[PDB]
């Protein structure tokens, strides 16, 4: 397979997306990741190296990619995400500037040759084309909406003692899973107190709050995707694409580009420009795995 | 570019070679290494991630992040090797210890876009083909031979107070640069005492020895090679290949393989078989970078 990738600032005043594509030829695997940072870049910077190291370390301990055990691979990937977040929060606490209020979502794909695994938190999305037809692979982690996934996130956020207004946890964050975001995790009580001093809430209001767990978590959903001959390409992208283009349209567009010139990098660059043409207001990051089939 | 690799035990009763190939598509960077361990695998095991981590770190530190002059890259690679060795020596002592007399040679290729760097200690070898002709990229670090490099190694080993018998420092080690080998570095006076206790040499003989520096060092030679279109492929391999096949024959063989079927992995596998056919008695490891020219 071949990679196409692009990651551009677009119309935003800062670039907080990043992409990683790394391969181990000896162990026949690749790692691709889209990170969509928010409220600064410190979390993305941390992830850009730390997350690969931890995921690969976890998969190599016991040769998990080789022995075909999904449950074991899922366990390892979740543990890796959670470990990285714990270390990120420590880093944020020790290098804090507070607010360093940064965080990042993450959509990761590991491929080893016939199978791929997706590990996902947040609001980027991964999809594939199977015999011309789109299949969406990930679910958004949003504290609103009508999907089963949405209902479950709202349930979790509320059980943690959080509240939601206008689709935002504590009227603040509109994604319910992410790396970083320490004020919704280990520093949530300080958050409340800061809110009182700032005039967001009343002392009376915050005195009534009881937290039982983190409102935002870094625990990923893991998906197994066998790379059967009918799987033509896979796209990982940030919401700078998906918020501005229907996913079926994205897949059809990439299909057409590849038919036109067979060049996945060119296809990827063209797609990003189409997002901008459709007035995308966000950073845009896109990774396409062209599997050289159809 | 495409990678071919093979790493086989051959007729040895243990496998002490290893290979690493890691690529980063977004930064157009890759790292490839051949390690030939001796007297155990502990040094190779350490180097497998530790040398990579240190080299990648170094080449992204400070200004190097934007390229850098050759002198600065050379200094960074040398310091990285030397740092890794210091940490390896500490390690060998703190873990599992004695007699851990392990060590390892290392030949590393880093590709940063259109330029390659070779960083080398020991007696693996790297070569390239330019328009069908061989160019050797590395010198053997052996305390024997007639080459200029050989003369230099012998001179350094003697200045440090070492002596050489039958191609071997203190009748023991047959390479003059390597990772690990603590008994030729920080524990050399203890080596002498040990030799006395074990009957290897007299107390009188050792009393006259005065060490001024390490006999074996981890300081690499660094070479820069522009990756122009006439550079067809680059081969890194352990001496299990080179001791049994002329280097010009290796290059011709690989050229003929690629011309015939265009498959670098098959070329690599076939080459290793030729080494076995030529009565190689050692572990054999080979990495071929096929740069994809006509
Ligand atoms: Mn963002
Ligand atoms: Mn975004
Ligand atoms: Mn060996
Ligand atoms: Mn050898």
mmCIF file of N, CA, C and O in Angstrom, chain A residues 2-3 5 19-28 48 52-53 60, chain B residues 2-3 5 19-28 48-49 52-53:
data_model
loop_
_atom_site.group_PDB
_atom_site.id
_atom_site.type_symbol
_atom_site.label_atom_id
_atom_site.label_comp_id
_atom_site.label_asym_id
_atom_site.label_seq_id
_atom_site.Cartn_x
_atom_site.Cartn_y
_atom_site.Cartn_z
ATOM 1 N N UNK A 2 0.196 2.361 -0.341
ATOM 2 C CA UNK A 2 0.887 3.637 -0.460
ATOM 3 C C UNK A 2 0.168 4.668 0.382
ATOM 4 O O UNK A 2 -1.044 4.595 0.539
ATOM 5 N N UNK A 3 0.919 5.634 0.909
ATOM 6 C CA UNK A 3 0.342 6.691 1.731
ATOM 7 C C UNK A 3 0.204 8.021 0.998
ATOM 8 O O UNK A 3 1.082 8.429 0.232
ATOM 9 N N UNK A 5 -0.817 12.049 2.319
ATOM 10 C CA UNK A 5 -1.120 12.798 3.543
ATOM 11 C C UNK A 5 -1.007 14.299 3.353
ATOM 12 O O UNK A 5 -0.182 14.791 2.594
ATOM 13 N N UNK A 19 -0.033 15.140 12.156
ATOM 14 C CA UNK A 19 -0.134 13.793 11.618
ATOM 15 C C UNK A 19 1.172 13.055 11.834
ATOM 16 O O UNK A 19 2.254 13.663 11.865
ATOM 17 N N UNK A 20 1.064 11.733 11.973
ATOM 18 C CA UNK A 20 2.236 10.884 12.140
ATOM 19 C C UNK A 20 2.042 9.664 11.261
ATOM 20 O O UNK A 20 0.967 9.070 11.263
ATOM 21 N N UNK A 21 3.054 9.310 10.477
ATOM 22 C CA UNK A 21 3.028 8.059 9.747
ATOM 23 C C UNK A 21 4.410 7.429 9.905
ATOM 24 O O UNK A 21 5.399 7.988 9.430
ATOM 25 N N UNK A 22 4.439 6.285 10.560
ATOM 26 C CA UNK A 22 5.750 5.724 10.932
ATOM 27 C C UNK A 22 5.796 4.265 10.564
ATOM 28 O O UNK A 22 4.808 3.557 10.697
ATOM 29 N N UNK A 23 6.725 3.585 10.091
ATOM 30 C CA UNK A 23 6.664 2.190 9.715
ATOM 31 C C UNK A 23 7.841 1.460 10.318
ATOM 32 O O UNK A 23 8.910 2.049 10.555
ATOM 33 N N UNK A 24 7.631 0.178 10.589
ATOM 34 C CA UNK A 24 8.708 -0.711 11.017
ATOM 35 C C UNK A 24 8.760 -1.802 9.966
ATOM 36 O O UNK A 24 7.884 -2.653 9.898
ATOM 37 N N UNK A 25 9.772 -1.765 9.108
ATOM 38 C CA UNK A 25 9.814 -2.694 8.002
ATOM 39 C C UNK A 25 10.089 -4.111 8.483
ATOM 40 O O UNK A 25 9.590 -5.073 7.901
ATOM 41 N N UNK A 26 10.901 -4.249 9.524
ATOM 42 C CA UNK A 26 11.290 -5.580 9.988
ATOM 43 C C UNK A 26 10.096 -6.301 10.597
ATOM 44 O O UNK A 26 9.897 -7.484 10.358
ATOM 45 N N UNK A 27 9.284 -5.564 11.349
ATOM 46 C CA UNK A 27 8.087 -6.142 11.967
ATOM 47 C C UNK A 27 6.819 -5.977 11.123
ATOM 48 O O UNK A 27 5.709 -6.308 11.571
ATOM 49 N N UNK A 28 6.992 -5.473 9.902
ATOM 50 C CA UNK A 28 5.901 -5.354 8.935
ATOM 51 C C UNK A 28 4.686 -4.635 9.481
ATOM 52 O O UNK A 28 3.549 -5.089 9.320
ATOM 53 N N UNK A 48 2.898 13.193 19.815
ATOM 54 C CA UNK A 48 3.504 12.935 18.542
ATOM 55 C C UNK A 48 4.599 11.966 18.703
ATOM 56 O O UNK A 48 4.685 11.047 17.978
ATOM 57 N N UNK A 52 3.253 6.796 19.838
ATOM 58 C CA UNK A 52 3.820 5.698 19.033
ATOM 59 C C UNK A 52 4.622 4.731 19.871
ATOM 60 O O UNK A 52 4.427 3.597 19.819
ATOM 61 N N UNK A 53 5.510 5.273 20.658
ATOM 62 C CA UNK A 53 6.384 4.493 21.476
ATOM 63 C C UNK A 53 5.644 3.568 22.387
ATOM 64 O O UNK A 53 5.984 2.439 22.547
ATOM 65 N N UNK A 60 4.498 -5.058 21.054
ATOM 66 C CA UNK A 60 5.638 -5.898 20.906
ATOM 67 C C UNK A 60 5.846 -6.729 22.147
ATOM 68 O O UNK A 60 6.526 -7.753 22.092
ATOM 69 N N UNK B 2 12.307 1.072 -1.570
ATOM 70 C CA UNK B 2 11.791 -0.190 -1.055
ATOM 71 C C UNK B 2 12.887 -0.876 -0.257
ATOM 72 O O UNK B 2 14.060 -0.807 -0.627
ATOM 73 N N UNK B 3 12.508 -1.542 0.830
ATOM 74 C CA UNK B 3 13.457 -2.241 1.683
ATOM 75 C C UNK B 3 13.434 -3.742 1.477
ATOM 76 O O UNK B 3 12.354 -4.338 1.360
ATOM 77 N N UNK B 5 15.239 -7.136 3.516
ATOM 78 C CA UNK B 5 16.045 -7.444 4.697
ATOM 79 C C UNK B 5 15.995 -8.920 4.989
ATOM 80 O O UNK B 5 15.005 -9.598 4.702
ATOM 81 N N UNK B 19 18.576 -6.565 13.342
ATOM 82 C CA UNK B 19 18.389 -5.504 12.354
ATOM 83 C C UNK B 19 17.197 -4.662 12.776
ATOM 84 O O UNK B 19 16.238 -5.156 13.413
ATOM 85 N N UNK B 20 17.255 -3.383 12.411
ATOM 86 C CA UNK B 20 16.184 -2.444 12.719
ATOM 87 C C UNK B 20 15.982 -1.600 11.462
ATOM 88 O O UNK B 20 16.959 -1.145 10.855
ATOM 89 N N UNK B 21 14.725 -1.408 11.055
ATOM 90 C CA UNK B 21 14.419 -0.482 9.948
ATOM 91 C C UNK B 21 13.155 0.274 10.334
ATOM 92 O O UNK B 21 12.084 -0.326 10.485
ATOM 93 N N UNK B 22 13.275 1.587 10.536
ATOM 94 C CA UNK B 22 12.148 2.418 10.977
ATOM 95 C C UNK B 22 12.058 3.613 10.055
ATOM 96 O O UNK B 22 13.058 4.259 9.779
ATOM 97 N N UNK B 23 10.871 3.874 9.526
ATOM 98 C CA UNK B 23 10.680 4.972 8.588
ATOM 99 C C UNK B 23 9.633 5.958 9.099
ATOM 100 O O UNK B 23 8.742 5.587 9.839
ATOM 101 N N UNK B 24 9.772 7.219 8.707
ATOM 102 C CA UNK B 24 8.810 8.254 9.074
ATOM 103 C C UNK B 24 8.450 8.916 7.762
ATOM 104 O O UNK B 24 9.265 9.635 7.193
ATOM 105 N N UNK B 25 7.243 8.664 7.273
ATOM 106 C CA UNK B 25 6.838 9.158 5.955
ATOM 107 C C UNK B 25 6.677 10.668 5.915
ATOM 108 O O UNK B 25 7.048 11.331 4.929
ATOM 109 N N UNK B 26 6.108 11.219 6.978
ATOM 110 C CA UNK B 26 5.837 12.641 7.022
ATOM 111 C C UNK B 26 7.103 13.490 6.969
ATOM 112 O O UNK B 26 7.129 14.513 6.295
ATOM 113 N N UNK B 27 8.153 13.049 7.653
ATOM 114 C CA UNK B 27 9.425 13.778 7.667
ATOM 115 C C UNK B 27 10.449 13.251 6.659
ATOM 116 O O UNK B 27 11.594 13.720 6.639
ATOM 117 N N UNK B 28 10.047 12.275 5.842
ATOM 118 C CA UNK B 28 10.941 11.658 4.852
ATOM 119 C C UNK B 28 12.261 11.205 5.470
ATOM 120 O O UNK B 28 13.344 11.477 4.943
ATOM 121 N N UNK B 48 18.800 -1.908 20.355
ATOM 122 C CA UNK B 48 17.730 -1.989 19.378
ATOM 123 C C UNK B 48 16.771 -0.799 19.446
ATOM 124 O O UNK B 48 16.439 -0.230 18.432
ATOM 125 N N UNK B 49 16.387 -0.413 20.646
ATOM 126 C CA UNK B 49 15.627 0.818 20.769
ATOM 127 C C UNK B 49 16.483 2.001 21.208
ATOM 128 O O UNK B 49 16.167 3.151 20.865
ATOM 129 N N UNK B 52 18.400 4.005 18.343
ATOM 130 C CA UNK B 52 17.390 4.686 17.540
ATOM 131 C C UNK B 52 16.900 5.907 18.285
ATOM 132 O O UNK B 52 16.913 6.983 17.780
ATOM 133 N N UNK B 53 16.478 5.703 19.514
ATOM 134 C CA UNK B 53 15.909 6.818 20.270
ATOM 135 C C UNK B 53 16.881 7.993 20.349
ATOM 136 O O UNK B 53 16.493 9.158 20.162
#
